[PDB]
Design a protein around this ligand. Structure first.
Ligand SMILES: NC(=O)c1ccc[n+]([C@@H]2O[C@H](COP(=O)([O-])OP(=O)(O)OC[C@H]3O[C@@H](n4cnc5c(N)ncnc54)[C@H](O)[C@@H]3O)[C@@H](O)[C@H]2O)c1
Ligand SMILES: NC(=O)c1ccc[n+]([C@@H]2O[C@H](COP(=O)([O-])OP(=O)(O)OC[C@H]3O[C@@H](n4cnc5c(N)ncnc54)[C@H](O)[C@@H]3O)[C@@H](O)[C@H]2O)c1
Ligand SMILES: NC(=O)c1ccc[n+]([C@@H]2O[C@H](COP(=O)([O-])OP(=O)(O)OC[C@H]3O[C@@H](n4cnc5c(N)ncnc54)[C@H](O)[C@@H]3O)[C@@H](O)[C@H]2O)c1
Ligand SMILES: NC(=O)c1ccc[n+]([C@@H]2O[C@H](COP(=O)([O-])OP(=O)(O)OC[C@H]3O[C@@H](n4cnc5c(N)ncnc54)[C@H](O)[C@@H]3O)[C@@H](O)[C@H]2O)c1
Ligand SMILES: c1cnc2c(c1)ccc1cccnc12
Ligand SMILES: c1cnc2c(c1)ccc1cccnc12
Ligand SMILES: c1cnc2c(c1)ccc1cccnc12
Ligand SMILES: c1cnc2c(c1)ccc1cccnc12
Lengths: 332, 332, 332, 332
């Protein structure tokens, strides 16, 4: 399926690498009014976090050419003005952070795009998490959301746990790497005042919709989970800390057994499982949505447990965006 | 009371500062075989985290003279060889990190100390938290513990919440600054493998006895709390995240009022209360044991809540060591 | 003199603090369209780097009241629309970073300011360094620059060394803390590609005009000095490394004596001198422009030496802005 | 050639990976009294900086088995007691940091080792830098030094520059990643007081022998270079900043031309060359000893220049150790 990328950022650029790396998505157009063509070459080829592109990248005849494939480059602030159709972009990855409502994201349809995948939670577009509810997608849906990085780590763990023991209620904290929304030194950050404080210096409490959004992705959990985040001074890789109360009793070893099972079978590639003495860097460029850390968790009793799961918030999510598009493409 | 300090490290130095900032306590001797007299002048004067000492520090006549007061300096590896009695050290703060059992900390009694306060949890020395169970101290105790930084954070809060609502069960996480036991790059840590991984690079899961220890300090909570830690790349200040289930219903505003009431009366100076948009650096050099962050916590319902509390692990704890000694002295 | 501040950022806030810590200067107005009145109360009160403000800050009656003094608050993007005259702002500190030419900074003259001090180098506004060429200021200058933090570090030192030994030629590097222009993760920086790379992850080469600018401030050194920068993952405090060739022979002890003599007389408060085993944090909130580090430099021979000098880029510079205004006012 | 590794640290473990990766060195014995066998598995397989070993690692029948090759594991504090000969270890990589003199390093010969390669500068063992003076090695030399990471970055650049233009004199600064000798928080560090200050917080001035040691590796430069270091808060990758005065005039483009030439021909794989807008992370796991950064340098005039060269201090040096051993092996 051919695809356009709106906003060539962390997710835009890594969705582009994941795309090249799958057989199944062809990136044909990129719009980013803040990154010109020769600058796009540089930002793609060099990556502080995930390392140099293993691949070829250049500018040629006004097009970005990756691994010999030529890509139409647009420079539009208003997505309503992007000539996607002409470019041959069937689906658009809305990865700017700034067009997340159906109405705003729907502007890509005016340039002749067929479907939009918003790389974030949406107030009103339907949200999908691969492995959890993607099969609820149907062809009527022109504008969809891939949810967040955090919702993609929480939801698969929660699916497995609810399915086997019943989640009565749960409260989630994510300890999360810094992102591009944050500031290098104490600076302005709108109505979210904590988010402006110096990102390298501080542990920063923040809001997250992800626990509530899981109750959308798994309706039986509606209103049973909420949570929060702490931003901390690492450049990538985040961890979910789920504290939950269960209906059926669950010894820790039975939780481990059932998560290992799921990681090996129907959630292979999405939910991982480890008992190794891992730290955050051990997941850098790991493509899973969620990896259970057996050693790090702790149970108070058979009904009350704290479960820990790792995620590369850039790289895992990026791969999920590709996967959703493949799934959508195959339903057309 | 005259005090000697064993281990002139982060805690030993900051206890010394806190002692001089308050005449609460007179420092008369210090032992550290890895820091000579001239070198102590340097390490006490300049502090990366808390700034340059406001006062005078020099070497005269083989002693360390802080604010005009001469301190006897020892250089012994074996605590049994330190002549505390000769120097007048009545109470000894045991802040090396390697003598935390009664048997080992007791060696100070050999050199003529009268009582020992271990600046960490102990497998067997009784543990005290100022404002929670410090009145359980009595003069029959020659060797006591001031518990851990984390316990001093969690306990005052857990007391208020338990006293007023009844904690049925709780799971804790502390997102904690790096300490001297950690490593600059991947290196040997012995039995605790994750802890040897590069401190500036990683989110590192780690073990903590604080939640259990709360059940000693608050006997009604015995066996009702457990937890874990994440070490993250900050140099100081940490945060407790307590997820608890309550017996009696408590609306979040009722929790706020109760906690604020507690900060203003009996736990004043120990448990603080804030509604501001704070981040970790706002607690650097803050002397509270625990500061409840109203805005950062979140309730799922009237019986299931996540409560957030900040602590300067270095500075709050060091002030508590002095306060505990002052109390002890009053009981003599 | 009454002062208005345009851009209530790292420098604008710290100038404000320095003004209140010294009555040197009265702050009467502040403009920042990205920080409302209530939000200013927050950002001024809490500072990750320099700590909580010691004094009072609140909003009353649409003004910002610091230490009892009410300050008029504007929210204009266009400096021409700020009514400085109505608020009584005689001098305007232009600390936004986006109005550094005479033509742009001059727009403050439209709203009724009398003179403008740009808190950065200027392509055309004359530049002054306290203790080096501030007596070249005269009342014919409506728009002046206080140069850069780096220039304020390099110039006092280069003056002493030149005055006494004759700098034939020099090459400078500054190893410099991160600033607000940098990015938390790899992102767009426009024309300056290295600067958009993740600030907490990298050693980043960067351009600096400081060495050349020294040749304006010290006309005899015109064309005799150039340099570069490395941005590194600290939040504050930077260091000059000046490698120079000398005309007259200077033994390193002669250099030390000359510099120390300079710190004790005419450049006292501007150029500091130390022999202690200092590191960057020992200069956090230090008001000097430049602190010579005797121990850290090294001579190849009597004519070829590497000289090291520390500066708090935020705090030293901010104090210099106030000092420059006080001087200006004395000349009126 | 079969080899033993004394000290399985950063360099010990990466020399081991580089060894597997060449065809030509077989690691057969490892001694490290602080890392037991199952711990060795973990420390080899997981690397925060260079990523998971792409390879197999396990413990079997009391031996460390990497990629099917079994390795004898010793646990001796005194290298005089290590049974290398029995193990079949012909050469030993002395990578503990603690046996760097001929006499101390010579203890490995008592256990039947034939030659020792000390992974650091030595006060008295002869030092080699591949590409610069390795051909001065002869079979009489049983104990040698591979110099330092910094000497390996400086010396190839200096060779090329001296060869073409004449280095009259030079002064070098290295801006260097933290290492395992440094401390996570302000702590003791012997007679080198700065080195104990908190490594994540500070820019730290330090000593280096590397500029002087280049005058050993290139005798014509004896007494013509010296320098210093700054340690800064990155976990790996360092940069040399060489300020030098030249005999023959050299336009910057002629310097670039001659370094590019050398990187392409006789210093291929040792000295690299780039004009890209690179930052430190772009060299992570780069095997060169030295990569010239054309864009980052700056010339004052044709005789006085500042040259910049990057190095992965762990990975580049590690590969050089292997290379030296191959060279030594082929001269036997
Ligand atoms: N970083 C993560 O870990 C992560 C994970 C999952 C989802 N997301 C979400 O993805 C979105 C992007 O996140 P990111 O981290 O890549 O941000 P980023 O800041 O790195 O990238 C955003 C890009 O959008 C471009 N842009 C801005 N306005 C534009 C416009 N009008 N038209 C075209 N391009 C424009 C910017 O120039 C930039 O290159 C956000 O909604 C974020 O919440 C982020
Ligand atoms: N840093 C914190 O946040 C914190 C807070 C609460 C409690 N603690 C506890 O306090 C203790 C000290 O921790 P720290 O962070 O100050 O560590 P540290 O490493 O900064 O200080 C320990 C000091 O003890 C010295 N020492 C080692 N062996 C010695 C001996 N045989 N005799 C005398 N001195 C010796 C070392 O030279 C060092 O100066 C530990 O038990 C720790 O768990 C630490
Ligand atoms: N941080 C330092 O080390 C340092 C030292 C010396 C000089 N400087 C210089 O001082 C200036 C400010 O740097 P800073 O570090 O404080 O940056 P900053 O980003 O912290 O502050 C700039 C402030 O200006 C505001 N602003 C942006 N557009 C505006 C407008 N149209 N009108 C009014 N305000 C506006 C922003 O909201 C922000 O509060 C820059 O020129 C910088 O080069 C910085
Ligand atoms: N890290 C760098 O970038 C770098 C580069 C070039 C050279 N070097 C040099 O290499 C040497 C090691 O450096 P490193 O960074 O790997 O240090 P490291 O601390 O990571 O490794 C040292 C290892 O030696 C072991 N060890 C200590 N005493 C021992 C003994 N008596 N017998 C056996 N093993 C023992 C330790 O347990 C540890 O695993 C030093 O001389 C250093 O100067 C380091
Ligand atoms: C045209 C282009 N791409 C596709 C299809 C048709 C049909 C199915 C499909 C499934 C996965 C990925 N791409 C496609
Ligand atoms: C587990 C892992 N991968 C997948 C699924 C479940 C479901 C659908 C799908 C579609 C495309 C690519 N991967 C997956
Ligand atoms: C035995 C073992 N290894 C070797 C030799 C003999 C001879 C030469 C040589 C050259 C490079 C690497 N290894 C060897
Ligand atoms: C440039 C690059 N690699 C080398 C040399 C010079 C010289 C010797 C040598 C021996 C073994 C492996 N590599 C090299």
């Amino acid at each position: 399926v051919k695809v356009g990328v709106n906003g060539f950022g962390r997710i835009g650029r890594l969705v582009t690498r994941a795309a090249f790396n799958s057989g199944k998505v062809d990136i044909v157009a990129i719009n980013d009014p803040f990154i010109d063509l020769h600058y796009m070459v540089y930002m793609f080829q060099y990556d502080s976090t995930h390392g140099k592109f293993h691949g070829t990248v250049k500018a040629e005849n006004g097009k970005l050419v990756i691994n010999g494939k030529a890509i139409t480059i647009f420079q539009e602030r208003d997505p309503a003005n992007i000539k996607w159709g002409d470019a041959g972009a069937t689906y658009v990855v809305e990865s700017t952070g700034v067009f997340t409502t159906m109405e705003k994201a729907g502007a890509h349809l005016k340039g002749g795009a067929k479907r939009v995948i918003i790389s974030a939670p949406s107030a009103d577009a339907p949200m999908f998490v691969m492995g959890v509810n993607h099969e609820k997608y149907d062809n009527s849906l022109k504008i969809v959301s891939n949810a967040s990085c955090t919702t993609n780590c929480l939801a698969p763990l929660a699916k497995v746990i609810h399915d086997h023991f019943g989640i009565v209620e749960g409260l989630m904290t994510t300890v999360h790497a810094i992102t591009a929304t944050q500031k290098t030194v104490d600076g302005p950050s709108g109505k979210l005042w904590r988010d402006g404080r110096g990102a390298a210096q501080n542990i920063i409490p923040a809001s997250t919709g992800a626990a509530k959004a899981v109750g959308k992705v798994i309706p039986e959990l509606n209103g049973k989970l909420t949570g929060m985040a702490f931003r901390v001074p690492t450049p990538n890789v985040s961890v979910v800390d789920l504290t939950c109360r269960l209906e059926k009793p669950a010894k820790y070893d039975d939780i481990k057994k059932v998560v290992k099972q799921a990681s090996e079978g129907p959630l292979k590639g999405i939910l991982g499982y480890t008992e190794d003495q891992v730290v955050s860097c051990d997941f850098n460029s790991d493509t899973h949505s969620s990896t259970f850390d057996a050693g790090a968790g702790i149970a108070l009793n058979d009904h009350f447990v704290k479960l820990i799961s790792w995620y590369d918030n850039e790289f895992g999510y990026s791969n999920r965006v590709v996967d959703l598009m493949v799934h959508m493409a195959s339903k057309e």
